[PDB]
Design a protein around this ligand. Sequence first.
Ligand SMILES: Nc1nc2c(ncn2[C@@H]2O[C@H](COP(=O)(O)OP(=O)(O)NP(=O)(O)O)[C@@H](O)[C@H]2O)c(=O)[nH]1
Length: 303
Amino acid sequence: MGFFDRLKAGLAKTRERLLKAIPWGGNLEEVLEELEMALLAADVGLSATEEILQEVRASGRKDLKEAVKEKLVGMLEPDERRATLRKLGFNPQKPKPVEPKGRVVLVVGVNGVGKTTTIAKLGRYYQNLGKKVMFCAGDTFRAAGGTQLSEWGKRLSIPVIQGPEGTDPAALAYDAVQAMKARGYDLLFVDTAGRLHTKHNLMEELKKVKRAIAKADPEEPKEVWLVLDAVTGQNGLEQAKKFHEAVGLTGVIVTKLDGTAKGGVLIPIVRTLKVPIKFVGVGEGPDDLQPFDPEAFVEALLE
Ligand SMILES: Nc1nc2c(ncn2[C@@H]2O[C@H](COP(=O)(O)OP(=O)(O)NP(=O)(O)O)[C@@H](O)[C@H]2O)c(=O)[nH]1
């Protein structure tokens, strides 16, 4: 049964191309050559791959396989504090559940990455951790796979703040924070537009929605999570940069790991944006959106 199982399976396409075939017993030069190709071919990026090799050549004298494993895990953790408790030995089965710093999670990403679907899964997740959850449909448009955020709300018995198409989304977000406060909800997930080439500059609208939320609640939002589709790989991180510059990301959710051989992309993401990966999507099941665990992630990558 297990949980670690779904993760290993989600990384199957990624692992099976070259990683699992690396002969950790042959002489360095051969295992490193194979290593670098497998990293690059999995979208780790030349920058991180190069660093990995260097840290492994002249420093990685603990067991090549281990030196590698540990460097990769080190690269998946931005928060020194957590890497410390780890170096020490903290590592139970199920990782600590993700806790938002505040009550408002602003969700961003390009159209079609899966923000609506992810929000639905995050509602379920949090509702089982015993939290009052509310949704805000900030992308008030013809956006969805025929399933609006509104529908998912009814299904999960989560209230959805919504308005007619074209409604001012800042005003929508503002209302949602007020309704959250007034009715005492634990967490509000605010969804947003994702089209980069419409008549309203996207980054400006996101900045405007964040302003409105704080205006209604000064310290909010304490989380701004960007959703990225692993299938997009290489460029989904590029665009991610722009989002980071406009509204300050505190986190990233990567969906569809299972549909690409580019699952190594989690490395350049964390290194480039300097925020942690919060959840990873390993399938389309309700429990397929897992809380990220560097250690377990890397183990799955290499076994
Ligand atoms: N298997 C799987 N499918 C996913 C995952 N994340 C997103 N999807 C799918 O990708 C599609 C895009 O999701 P959606 O929530 O509609 O994206 P958006 O980013 O909100 N796009 P839109 O603006 O069209 O509403 C959905 O049909 C959803 O099933 C994941 O981790 N795993």
